[PDB]
C-alpha cells in the first residue's frame with residue numbers, strides 16, 4: 047500500500063549517506079605535514095559524496111513518481127520494488143568506483159549497467175501495473191482514460207536506461223569524452239521538457255517528509271555510529287594512562303564527545319526547523335523538493351564540520367579557519383531550508399495552507415524559526431572582525447536554547463509593535 | 465502532529481542497531497591460529513549487541529507508551545523529545561562501557577546516570593503535558609477524568625530511574641555485588657504491574673497498553689532497512705579497488721583486483737535478498753493486523769534482534785577460511801540464525817489464538833479468504849531453513865545456495881503455489 051513506500055524510502059535515505067562514512071572515518075591528524083595531500087583526499091571524498099547524494103535522490107524521485115502512478119500495490123509489486131531497491135543501493139559504490147577509475151572502461155560500464163538495471167526493473171513494475179488497471183492503477187483519471195499513458199510512462203522511465211545504454215556503447219570503446227551523455231540522465235527527470243500526461247507532477251509531501259526525516263536521523267547519529275565502536279576504552283588500557291582510573295583514559299574521548307553533542311544538537315534543531323516548516327506545507331511543489339535535496343546534502347555534510355571544530359590539530363593558533371568551515375556548512379544547510387520556505391511568494395494560495403500566509407497568524411513565528419540558523423551562523427562567520435573566535439560555542443549554545451523561549455521571542459516583536 | 469514520532473523512532477532504530485557494527489567489522493580471517501580468541505571475542509560482541517538491542521527496545525517501548533499518553537505535540541514538546549532522543553542515544557555506548565568494565569563502578573554509574581537522564585526528561589514531558597490539559601491531552605479519556613492519571617504516569621515513568629539511582633548508590637556503597645537493579649528496571653513494566661500489583665481509585669485504560677501498530681511498523685521498517693544496507697555500508701566503504709593496485713593483481717585489468725571482493729560481494733547480494741524477504745513477510749503480516757497486542761510486540765522485538773544478527777551469518781557462509789572441509793558448520797549457524805529470525809515471526813503470526821475478534825481483521829481468520837496464503841507466506845522461511853538444517857543427513861552442504869535462491873523465487877509464484885493446494889482440495 048502506502049506503507050511499502052515507507053521502507054523503500056528509509057532504505058533509500060540510508061543509502062543516500064553511505065558515502066558520507068569515509069568522510070568522517072578519515073583522520074585529520076597533524077602527525078605529518080601531509081595536510082596538502084590529505085586535503086586533496088578530503089575534497090575528493092567530499093566531491094564523491096555530494097555527487098552520490100545528487101545521484102541517489104534523482105533515482106528516489108523517479109521511483110517516487112513511478113510509485114505515485116501505481117498507487118495501490120500487491121505482493122508481486124512489493125517484490126519488484128524490493129528488486130528495484132536492491133539495484134538502486136548499488137549506485138553509490140559503483141559511482142565511487144567509476145570516479146576513482148575514470149579512464150578504465152569497466153568502471154562507467156558497471157555504473158551504466160547499475161542504472162540500466164533499475165531502469166528495466168521499474169519498466170517491469172510499470173508493465174505489470176498497466177496489465178492490471180483495475181487493481182493497481184492509482185485513480186479514475188489513470189484508470190479510465192485514453193489508455194495511451196503506457197507509452198509516455200514507459201518513455202519517462204526507460205529514457206534513463208536508454209540514454210545510459212547509448213552512453214555505455216559510446217563510453218570507453220572509443221572517445222571517453224562524451225560520457226556527459228551520462229550526466230544528462232539527471233537533468234531530464236528534473237527539467238528538460240519543462241522548457242523543451244502530466245506525470246511530472248510534484249512529489250507527495252509525505253514521501254519527501256519521510257526521506258528528510260530518515261536522512262536527518264542517520265546523519266545525527268552518524269557520529270555515535272563510530273564513537274561507540276571505537277572509543278571503548280579497551281581494558282588493556284591498564285598500561286595506558288600510566289594507571290587505571292577509567293575516567294582518565296575516558297577523558298581522551300572528551301573532544302569527540304563535545305563534537306558529537308554539538309553535531310546532534312545542530313542536526314536535530316535543523317530537523318525541527320524542517321518539521322515546523324513541513325507541518326504547514328500544503329502541497330510540496332517541485333522547487334520545494336529541489337531546495338530540500340540540497341539542504342539535505344549539506345546537512346549530511348555537517349558532521350565532518352562539527353568534527354573538525356572539536357579537533358586540536360597542530361599549530362592551532364592560525365587554524366581557526368575550522369570554525370569558518372563549520373559555520374559556512376551550517377549556513378548552506380540552513381539557507382537552503384529557508385529558501386524552501388520563502389518559495390511561497392505567489393504559490394501561497396496552493397501551498398503553505400493558510401495559517402502562515404503573508405500577515406497570517408504565526409507567519410513571523412515560523413519565519414524567524416527558520417531564519418534563526420542562517421543568521422546565527424552568519425554571526426559566528428562574522429568572527430573575522432575580532433579574535434575571540436571561540437564565541438561559536440556560546441553562540442550555538444544560546445542558539446539551541448532559543449526555540450524553547452522563541453514563542454516569547456516572537457512576543458517581543460509583538461510588544462515592539464508599538 | 466505525529467511526524468515527530470516517526471523521526472523519533474527512525475532515529476531510535478539506528479541507535480538500537482549501532483552496536484551491530486563491530487560484530488560485522490570483526491576479522492573472520494584465521495590467517496593466525498587464534499580461533500579460540502576470535503570466537504570468544506565474537507561471542508562477547510554478539511552478547512553485547514543483543515543486550516543493547518533489548519535495552520534500547522524497552523526504552524523505545526516506554527517512550528512510545530508515554531507519547532501515546534500524550535496525543536498532540538508542541539514546539540517545547542518537540543525540543544524535550546529531542547533531548548530525550550539524545551539521552552537515550554547515549555545508551556548503547558554507555559552499556560558497552562559498563563559491560564567491558566563490570567568491576568569498576570564508573571561503568572554502572574554512567575549507565576544509571578544515562579537512565580536518570582532520559583527517565584527524568586520523560587517526567588518533564590508528562591509534567592508539561594499535564595500542565596496543559598486542553599492542549600496536549602491525548603483524548604477525552606485523559607481530558608475528562610480524575611486527573612490522578614498524572615500521579616500514575618509519573619510513577620510508571622520514574623520507577624525506572626529510581627531503581628537506577630539505587631543501583632548507582634549501591635555501586636559505591638560497598639562491594640556492588642548485586643548490581644542487578646537494572647535488570648529489575650528492564651523487567652518491571654513488562655510483568656510486574658500486569659501480575660504483581662496494580663493501582664486504581666473513573667479508570668479506563670492507558671497505564672501500559674499495547675503499542676500502536678504504526679509505531680512498531682515504522683521501527684521494524686527502520687531496522688530492516690538498516691541491516692539490509694548495513695552490509696552494503698561495508699562493501700561500499702572498504703572495497704574500492706585502490707588505483708595504487710596497478711602493482712597489485714600483477715597487472716591492471718580492474719576486473720582482476722575487483723574479483724577479490726567477489727566473496728563478500730555475493731555475501732551482501734544474498735543477505736539483502738534474505739533480509740528483504742523477511743521484511744516482505746513482515747509487511748504482508750502486519751497489513752492485516754488490526755490491533756497489535758503486547759505479546760505481538762514482544763515477539764516482534766526478538767524477531768528484529770535475530771534479523772539484525774543475520775548479516776554476521778551471511779558473512780560467515782560466504783567465507784573461505786582455512787580448513788574449509790569440516791568447517792562447513794558455518795552454513796549450520798547461518799541457517800539457525802535465519803530459522804530463529806523467522807520462527808519468531810511465525811510465532812507472532814500464531815498469536816491469533818482466538819483473538820480474531822480484536823487482532824487479525826476478518827480476512828486471515830480460520831477459514832478466511834487467504835489465511836492459508838498468509839500462513840504459507842510466513843512459514844516459507846522457517847520450513848526452508850529447517851530443510852537446509854537437514855543438511856546433516858548428507859554431505860552436499862552447498863545446497864544452501866540453491867535452496868535460498870528457490871526461497872526468494874517462491875513468493876513470486878506464491879499465488880499459484882496456493883492454487884496448488886486449492887486444486888489438491890480434491
Ligand SMILES: [K+]
Nearest residue numbers: 056474682686
Ligand atoms: K521511517
Ligand SMILES: [K+]
Nearest residue numbers: 060264478686
Ligand atoms: K534509517
Ligand SMILES: [K+]
Nearest residue numbers: 060264478697
Ligand atoms: K547506517
